[PDB]
């Protein structure tokens, strides 16, 4: 299943660059074709920032935004118990200071009463850790797909609807028939373009601007 | 509270009594004193020991073995100091590999068949004595160990295996009823002993909160060798020894005076043996000796 | 990934039988066609017992056969250390009996020497459990695929080779053209049959005989 | 073997000495006796205590605090009984949540900065005394605790965090060099104490095999309060007490007579305080008193 322990035991026996350059040239002609010539280009424009956040994803740091999202609502039950958790933790550390400050000789009864309260609260401590960390990782697993539906639903709807409706027309005679084949499959009229290269390879358009930001901070 | 054991006599619906602690305290003297003073108001009382120190022979100068009997001077004293290794002699190759799979098997099954022989008769009450505690308290774990072991034996199977399967099922249901009889608290009680120094008190409190984490209470705690001064005569080392003994004594007074009982028992000059001497030693568990202090 | 915890959180919001009967009828006509009429039918005959063992698989009990496979070879290093393991286990239980038989009072020095040998051997015990159980589960993971190659290589080779070569000819005029379509795809000449239904649905032929054995023992 | 501590005097390349055990033994008397007899042949010796019993004040009737100094009657006696809770006073909200993430943080960092102050000076040798053992031996775990804590703090990050990151790195490298100085065995030694009864011997053997599981040997073991009979005068309880004391004494003779040393130290009538009285008590660790036995 891993294809790595199988590779750990396999030791016991004994075009794409020029492809990205032509996608660069078609992106140049697609960017030139807008100035001399609408709404679907802005739809691709928002999907570019969606793929950007997919790149500059903090899969935890999105939930770090969700933390202040739920550090916000005062009617939240869980942040209420989070505050009650820290309050019990404060009383916890207080008695622990009074414990380690005490002596095991002459307050042995007070010794035991402190010890009993110590392991009294010590058990209820991680009960909340079991509760809230379960809620937090389940809430994250919900909203990961909750965002993923809004991402890939627009990643496939654009190809479902507004496919026969031509987005724009290729200049007559520039591309051989076999290249034009791509257009024939999504139902768009021959001589017009579909909406694919804007889905996948348009992510490269901002990708160099991503490395531009890599030069900005660093 | 009341400095005696009158409450154990007063219930009469009690069936099982556990008494323990650690070594160096002479628990056997406490056990025999409990049994003899119990026999004044009882019908059929059985003692049971499992400590490898064959001490009841020292208690009565009479050899005992693997069968109960009545010893002289009494009509109700029955006991049999047994070994767990006889069951390993019953094991003397696959069952030993099963003992490798789980480090403890045979001791629980031996204790099981022992308790079946216990419930064979119609005895009124029984009493106990045990080894150090980390080797004791596993008996509350024997039902789970038994279950895991039976499941595993069946796992390997996947001579007759069904015979040992049914035997382990009988041991399972029997140990479940006995541990279920444990938490009843109307026939199962527990007393612990200790002595005036630090570590004895330390592991005593550890035992108490241990049984607190299983839901079995207690109300009676005995101490030992509490030296009280002789009028007129004095040893100068004994004076300071009494002083330090009072120091821890009052600390236990600061703990347990609310809902437990304290039994004062002084050391005598000799290891008290013989029947009548043990009677006089046992008498103090009802009438507490008190000097002016 | 599991599609089960996702189903555990999905609770938070609010023809084939008649297909097997026609494969039974084509297996009846395939069994009748051999008496009045070769080697490839015996190849399907062995693949039927292979799929049978796939059904009556004990995925552990195959390795239970592998156990006596390696309880056989005397030149095996591992079964040698298995015997040395049981020998150390026997000396282990021996000293443990001598330990629990002893008393903690009057042989306290002998007490400690026993205790030291006890935890001496107790650590080396599970070192072999780490060694051999690793070897055993790795050997199982090798031979699962080692059998799976001999199974599915014959499950796809039959369709690779001897495809254009016709195995047998369908009676002229019994099946409509659209049914005959199946033959056209594997390169077999029109009017002859390919080798598919013998691969998958022939498993049903012995499956009723499997339930015949279900009536034999039970 | 040799019934003294002459081998600790003879090496001189020793730097660190650990001495411990359990309560009820008077380890402070043993510690001060070790330090004073050490100072006869040494240059710069420092005592360090962390037990919440502020006992060195009782040892010399002079108040001490959070700074070393020289006490009267000596040119080399330096000590400072410190508290770990002062570092918690240094903590007095996120760092306390970090203390929730790992139950022990501040004690190791306090012990760390203490040892930095220790290696600030140019002292010849140091000595120690500790609390009960389960609270002691965590210092061999402080390097790992420190590493895990620093990793976790960085995990949350993913006021300045880099300052506490570099501070914890300095604590990391310092504690790694000190624990690395521990296993050198040419400057780090360990002696344990005990008394003639069961449980003291029990946890003593547990400690020895504990240090055996870390690769640090020992060769010297001291006992205490070994009562020897007075000629002519006798207490009858003291006779049997001597008998039982001999019983365990000979059992320790059956263990450690091969490669360890036994120090006989009798109890005196008073808690030995004062400088000159402590000198006489310390003298016996070289010249062993022996009656005809
Ligand atoms: Zn005396």
Numbering used by the authors:
A (entry chain C), C (entry chain D): 300 to 313, 335 to 357, 1001 to 1181
B (entry chain A), D (entry chain B): 14 to 105, 120 to 185, 205 to 339
Q: What text does the study give?
A:
The eukaryotic guided entry of tail-anchored proteins (GET) pathway mediates the biogenesis of tail-anchored (TA) membrane proteins at the endoplasmic reticulum. In the cytosol, the Get3 chaperone captures the TA protein substrate and delivers it to the Get1/Get2 membrane protein complex (GET insertase), which then inserts the substrate via a membrane-embedded hydrophilic groove. Within the membrane targeting stages of the GET pathway, the homodimeric ATPase Get3 (also called TRC40 in metazoans) adopts closed and open conformations in response to nucleotide load and interactions with other pathway components, allowing binding and release of the TA protein respectively. However, the cryo-EM structures and native mass spectrometry of hsGet1/Get2 and scGet1/Get2 show they form a 2:2 heterotetramer, which is stabilised by Get3 and interfacial lipid binding and is important for efficient TA protein insertion.
We subsequently obtained single-particle cryo-EM reconstructions of both amphipol- and nanodisc-reconstituted ctGet2ΔN-Get1/Get3 at an overall resolution of 5.0 Å and 4.6 Å respectively. In both reconstructions, there is clear density in the membrane region for two three-helix bundles at a local resolution of 6.5 Å. Weak density also shows that helix α3’ is present in the same conformation relative to ctGet2 TMD3 in both the amphipol and nanodisc reconstruction. Furthermore, the density map for the nanodisc-reconstituted sample provides evidence that ctGet2 TMD1 and TMD2 occupy the same position in the heterodimer as the equivalent hsGet2 TMDs, albeit they are poorly resolved and likely exhibit flexibility on the edge of the complex. Interestingly, the conserved fold of the ctGet1/Get2 heterodimer adopts a different position in the membrane compared to the structure of hsGet1/Get2, with each heterodimer half exhibiting a 40° rotation with respect to the membrane plane. This is largely due to ctGet1 TMD1/TMD2 not adopting the parallel arrangement observed for hsGet1, instead being tilted by 40° relative to each other. As a result of the rearrangement of ctGet1/Get2, the hydrophilic groove of ctGet1/Get2 is tilted so that it is open towards the cytosolic leaflet of the membrane, in contrast to the hsGet1/Get2 hydrophilic groove opening to the cytosol. In addition, ctGet2 TMD3 no longer completely traverses the ER membrane, which is notable given the high number of charged residues found at the N-terminal portion of this helix and the adjoining cytoplasmic loop. Indeed, we observe significant thinning of the nanodisc in the vicinity of ctGet2 TMD3. As this helix encloses one side of the hydrophilic groove, such membrane distortion would likely lower the energetic barrier for substrate insertion.
